[PDB]
Write a protein that holds these residues in place. Structure first.
Motif, short mmCIF file in Angstrom:
data_model
loop_
_atom_site.label_atom_id
_atom_site.label_comp_id
_atom_site.label_asym_id
_atom_site.label_seq_id
_atom_site.Cartn_x
_atom_site.Cartn_y
_atom_site.Cartn_z
N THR A 1 -2.30 12.11 -7.03
CA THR A 1 -1.37 11.26 -5.81
C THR A 1 -1.16 9.97 -6.27
N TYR A 2 -0.29 9.32 -5.68
CA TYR A 2 0.00 7.89 -5.79
C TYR A 2 -0.54 6.95 -4.69
N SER A 3 -0.77 5.49 -5.18
CA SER A 3 -1.04 4.64 -4.25
C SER A 3 -0.13 3.15 -4.30
N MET A 4 -0.48 2.45 -3.24
CA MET A 4 0.49 1.44 -3.36
C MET A 4 -0.27 0.32 -2.76
N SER A 5 0.18 -1.10 -3.14
CA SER A 5 -0.58 -2.30 -2.60
C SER A 5 0.63 -3.27 -2.12
N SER A 6 0.98 -3.00 -0.82
CA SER A 6 2.01 -4.12 -0.52
C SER A 6 1.36 -5.20 0.30
N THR A 7 1.87 -6.57 -0.17
CA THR A 7 1.26 -7.76 0.38
C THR A 7 2.17 -8.73 0.59
N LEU A 8 2.13 -9.34 1.70
CA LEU A 8 2.97 -10.30 2.36
C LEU A 8 2.40 -11.73 2.34
N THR A 9 2.85 -12.52 1.44
CA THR A 9 2.50 -13.88 1.38
C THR A 9 3.19 -14.91 2.29
N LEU A 10 2.42 -15.82 3.03
CA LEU A 10 3.00 -16.59 4.24
C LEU A 10 1.98 -17.82 4.04
N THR A 11 2.64 -18.78 4.63
CA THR A 11 1.90 -20.24 4.73
C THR A 11 0.99 -20.08 6.04
N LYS A 12 -0.11 -20.95 5.87
CA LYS A 12 -1.02 -20.88 7.08
C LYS A 12 -0.34 -21.50 8.33
N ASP A 13 0.44 -22.38 8.26
CA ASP A 13 1.09 -22.73 9.26
C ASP A 13 2.18 -21.66 9.73
N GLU A 14 3.10 -21.31 9.03
CA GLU A 14 4.00 -20.03 9.29
C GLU A 14 3.37 -18.95 9.72
N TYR A 15 1.92 -18.59 9.29
CA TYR A 15 1.52 -17.38 9.49
C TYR A 15 1.06 -17.43 11.20
N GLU A 16 0.06 -18.48 11.28
CA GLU A 16 -0.41 -18.69 12.61
C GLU A 16 0.52 -18.91 14.02
N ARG A 17 1.99 -19.08 13.57
CA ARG A 17 3.02 -19.14 14.79
C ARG A 17 3.57 -17.93 14.79
N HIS A 18 2.79 -16.76 14.72
CA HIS A 18 3.12 -15.53 15.12
C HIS A 18 1.78 -14.65 15.35
N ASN A 19 2.23 -13.58 16.11
CA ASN A 19 0.97 -12.84 16.72
C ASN A 19 0.95 -11.29 16.26
N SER A 20 1.97 -10.55 16.03
CA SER A 20 2.03 -9.29 15.59
C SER A 20 2.58 -8.99 14.49
N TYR A 21 1.93 -8.23 13.66
CA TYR A 21 2.36 -7.79 12.07
C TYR A 21 2.10 -6.30 12.19
N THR A 22 3.06 -5.62 11.94
CA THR A 22 3.46 -4.05 11.96
C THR A 22 3.58 -3.58 10.38
N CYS A 23 2.86 -2.71 10.07
CA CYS A 23 3.27 -2.21 8.78
C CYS A 23 3.68 -0.72 8.79
N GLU A 24 4.94 -0.37 9.03
CA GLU A 24 5.66 0.89 9.06
C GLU A 24 6.18 1.33 7.64
N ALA A 25 5.94 2.71 7.72
CA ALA A 25 6.29 3.21 6.27
C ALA A 25 7.03 4.57 6.73
N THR A 26 8.00 4.93 5.60
CA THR A 26 8.79 6.40 5.74
C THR A 26 8.59 7.14 4.62
N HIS A 27 8.29 8.27 4.80
CA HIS A 27 7.82 9.28 3.94
C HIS A 27 8.26 10.55 4.07
N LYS A 28 8.45 11.50 2.87
CA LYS A 28 8.81 12.80 3.48
C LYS A 28 8.27 13.64 4.16
N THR A 29 6.93 13.85 4.05
CA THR A 29 6.07 14.61 4.62
C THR A 29 6.00 14.67 6.21
#
Lengths: 208, 211, 387
Positions: free
Chosen positions: B172-200
């Motif tokens: 089976t496979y695996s994946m390492s998604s990462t989102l890089t942002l600045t501390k100032d730009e990071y803390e000026r938002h609240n929700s972070y949603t990690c949605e995926a679409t796959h056949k199964t």
């Protein structure tokens, strides 16, 4: 075929990979150079024909130079003005009585950058369910070679090592590990990141 | 340059199956063609030279052929070691050119990804940047779509994904998604949603958190 | 270095040349031991040279399909075996057959061997090499007949064929461990169909064709002199056999100098400029021979000095134009070299026959006028060939 290479060079510098040819019939069969970028398949570079006649790739015919040394029985690939593109695994192929590129070389990983073997920066990753997944994000190291170990090298059943990627200099790899909910956080889980190039190994415990 | 487009780009099949490769040529290359397999460790081994000739010491299941501009390579009864990379090589006109390759994977084990979100540590916010990690472990096929959202539907674009070649024992496979942002730009938002679409699952799997 | 592949190739090349140059002196002694008529004397040169024209068309492209080493090294064995096999020829008709079977060893040189010399070495280095080994090959036409005359008076003539196999056996072991493999198409299928498609492709290449013909036309005035100088000088101008063979010295001596100068200039001038530097003696010499013999119908010294100047330009130009024409087509060089040789064999066969009849119904002037237009053809083909 054994190709001695530099390993690390800088942009706008020169390199010199020297492939030593096994066999008395050194100046009989031609010799090629093939490179493999980290992702972008295979690329044919050039060829020398045993009597010295050279044959280069048109796009790279600008910097390429393939010459022989009859005394030491070896062929060189000399390339000028490098950059990020020419970071690749360079191979030493050889013609034979049965056509072209019948015997291949081991390969030498040549790299084109500037940073001086920077030690890594380890950052933990922590979240409640059936089983829990934990991680270990490693950022900022120069040679693409780091080994992560969990629980002093005991539990590596559901561990996922992820390939490192370049981020405007230096790499940011990742590691994952999965254990049942009963063990953590009541038990200790630590990722030992070994970076032999900078002579460093960093352990970091995970806390929610 | 005689460009050599190799298809299928990737292919999966179980053992003992008759499967074929193909390299179409930009222009006539005659019978001048090679077939090379690359072992996982990187060892490149030549198997077939001049369209059809098997090299010395290659199993009988291999056999190359030609039909017009299309040159193929078939393995009659696949074996465990055969699941590797495969490139073709044209030596009709200089410069010699390789094909786009074909990486071969085993069987059709079907499963769903074990997604899990990870906020950035405060130790990383020392440097002035934040990386939101999202592991999509244990899933097959490799075909998948994933996306981040910084609100209800506010998507982002600064993601960086890393896959692993299909895992040793479970295939089976695996994946390492990462989102890089600045501390100032990071803390000026609240929700972070990690949605995926796959056949199964036609039901989209979701994993999120709120600071 | 281990560049004795040129050195051992010319040894074999030289050995096939003395297989005819040294034999014709003793052909009268040959035909008398066999108790056959004197009309069997010329047919030993006819049989030997007809063998070189036989497998030219196949050996080249075959060497592309299975390599330049096995094909060439086989021909060296064919030469050696047929050299010794003639010692079992019991009658003159067997002798003539083996004369032709030995002659097949010559078409391994152009189509297979020299194809490897050109593919193996760089442009300027290969021209120094082909020009200098050409001089070592010219030792056979120059000294072979004189050495063959001295041989038959002190030693048996059959001992020449032992000498040929000995020099070629030296050459074989040299070629074995030194000859590079330069065939790209190794392992390919060989059929008359694909072989026919190969030659149609090269004949479509007008630039290649224009250069291969230029090699025939510019070299034809030299072969027209070899084939007819006995008739022109001796039976025509009533000169001795000494003064005939003496008039060959300024011509064939100038050919060697053209190669010696070309070799030294390989590193100091582009191949384009070397051909043009040789093109001036070619037209001047042909014009000297042409203009002086139309004014003076029996000016054979102006003809000799005219052809000598022209012979100097050929040594300067040929080895370069041979290289450019060979690589002016992307076909495998065995097929290309064979095509070049056959295009030249065609120009020489038909051309010499015209120059023979050119000298009959019109003296030295028409023989030299016919030589001049061939130089004009070459010149006009080089204007098309160089850009």
């Amino acid at each position: 075929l054994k190709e001695s290479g530099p390993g690390l060079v800088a942009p706008s510098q020169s390199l010199s990979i020297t492939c030593t040819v096994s066999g008395f019939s050194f100046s009989i069969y031609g010799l090629h150079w093939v490179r493999q970028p980290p992702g972008k398949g295979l690329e044919w570079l050039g060829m020398i024909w045993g009597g010295g006649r050279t044959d280069y790739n048109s796009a790279l015919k600008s910097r390429l130079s393939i010459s022989k040394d009859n005394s030491k029985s070896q062929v060189f690939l000399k390339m000028k003005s490098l950059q990020t593109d020419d970071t690749a695994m360079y191979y030493c192929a050889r013609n034979s009585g049965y056509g072209n590129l019948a015997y291949w070389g081991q390969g030498t990983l040549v790299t084109v950058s500037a940073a001086k073997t920077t030690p890594p920066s380890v950052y933990p990753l922590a979240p409640t369910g059936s089983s829990v997944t934990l991680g270990c994000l490693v950022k900022g190291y120069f040679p693409e070679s780091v080994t992560v170990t969990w629980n002093s090298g005991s539990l590596s059943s559901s561990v996922h090592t992820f390939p490192a990627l370049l981020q405007s200099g230096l790499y940011t790899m990742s590691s994952s590990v999965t254990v049942p909910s009963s063990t953590w956080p009541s038990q200790t889980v630590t990722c030992s990141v070994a970076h032999p190039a900078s002579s460093t190994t960093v352990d970091k415990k995970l806390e929610p | 340059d005689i460009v050599m487009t190799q298809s299928p780009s990737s292919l999966s099949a179980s053992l003992g199956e008759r499967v074929s490769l193909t390299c179409r040529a930009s222009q006539d290359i005659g019978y001048s063609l090679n077939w090379l397999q690359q072992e996982p460790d990187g060892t490149i081994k030549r198997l077939i030279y001049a369209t059809s000739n098997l090299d010395s010491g290659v199993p009988k299941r291999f056999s190359g052929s030609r039909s017009g501009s299309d040159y193929s390579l078939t393995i009659s009864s696949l074996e465990s070691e055969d699941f590797v990379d495969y490139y073709c090589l044209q030596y009709a006109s200089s410069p010699y050119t390789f094909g786009g390759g074909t990486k071969l994977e085993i069987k059709r084990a079907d499963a769903a990804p074990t997604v899990s979100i990870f906020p950035p540590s405060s130790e990383q916010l020392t440097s002035g940047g934040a990386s939101v990690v999202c592991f999509l472990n244990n899933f097959y096929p490799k075909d998948i779509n994933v996306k981040w959202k910084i609100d209800g539907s506010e998507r982002q674009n600064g993601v960086l994904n890393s896959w692993t070649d299909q895992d040793s024992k479970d295939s089976t496979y695996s994946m390492s998604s990462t989102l890089t942002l600045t501390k100032d730009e990071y803390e000026r938002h609240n929700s972070y949603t990690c949605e995926a679409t796959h056949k199964t699952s036609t039901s989209p799997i979701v994993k999120s958190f709120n600071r | 270095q281990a560049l004795l592949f040129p050195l051992c190739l010319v040894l074999y090349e030289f050995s096939t040349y003395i297989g005819n140059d040294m034999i014709q002196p003793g052909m009268l002694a040959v035909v008398e031991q066999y108790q056959a008529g004197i009309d069997w004397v010329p047919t030993s040169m006819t049989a030997y040279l007809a063998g070189g024209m036989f497998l030219q068309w196949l050996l080249g492209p075959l060497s592309d399909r299975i390599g330049r080493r096995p094909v060439m090294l086989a021909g060296v064995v064919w030469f050696i075996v047929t050299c010794l096999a003639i010692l079992l020829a019991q009658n003159i008709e067997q002798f003539t057959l083996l004369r032709f079977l030995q002659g097949i060893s010559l078409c391994f040189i152009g189509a297979v061997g020299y194809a490897a010399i050109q593919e193996s070495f760089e442009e300027a280095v290969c021209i120094k090499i082909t020009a200098l080994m050409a001089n070592v090959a010219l030792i056979a036409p120059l000294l072979g007949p004189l050495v063959g005359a001295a041989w038959i008076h002190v030693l048996p003539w059959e001992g020449m064929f032992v000498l040929f196999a000995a020099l070629a056996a030296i050459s074989f072991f040299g070629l074995q461990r030194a000859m590079p493999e330069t065939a790209t198409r190794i392992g390919e299928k060989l059929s008359l169909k694909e072989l026919g498609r190969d030659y149609k492709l090269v004949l479509k290449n007008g630039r290649f064709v224009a250069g291969a013909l230029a090699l025939g036309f510019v070299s034809l005035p030299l072969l027209a002199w070899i084939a007819q100088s006995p008739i022109i000088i001796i039976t025509g101008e009533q000169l001795s056999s000494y003064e005939y063979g003496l008039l060959q010295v300024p011509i064939f001596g100038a050919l060697i100098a053209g190669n010696l100068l070309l070799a030294r200039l390989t590193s100091r001038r582009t191949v384009r400029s070397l051909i043009i530097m040789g093109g001036w003696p070619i037209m001047i010499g042909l014009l000297v021979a042409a203009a002086a013999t139309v004014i003076s119908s029996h000016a054979y010294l102006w003809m000799t000095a005219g052809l000598s100047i022209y012979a100097f330009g050929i040594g300067l130009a040929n080895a370069g134009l041979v290289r450019l024409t060979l690589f002016a087509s992307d076909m495998s060089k065995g097929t290309v070299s064979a095509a070049m040789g056959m295009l030249q064999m065609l120009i020489f066969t038909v051309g010499i026959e015209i120059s023979k009849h050119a000298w009959l119904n019109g003296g030295n002037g028409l023989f030299n006028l016919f030589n001049l237009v061939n130089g004009i053809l070459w010149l006009s083909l080089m204007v098309i060939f160089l850009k």
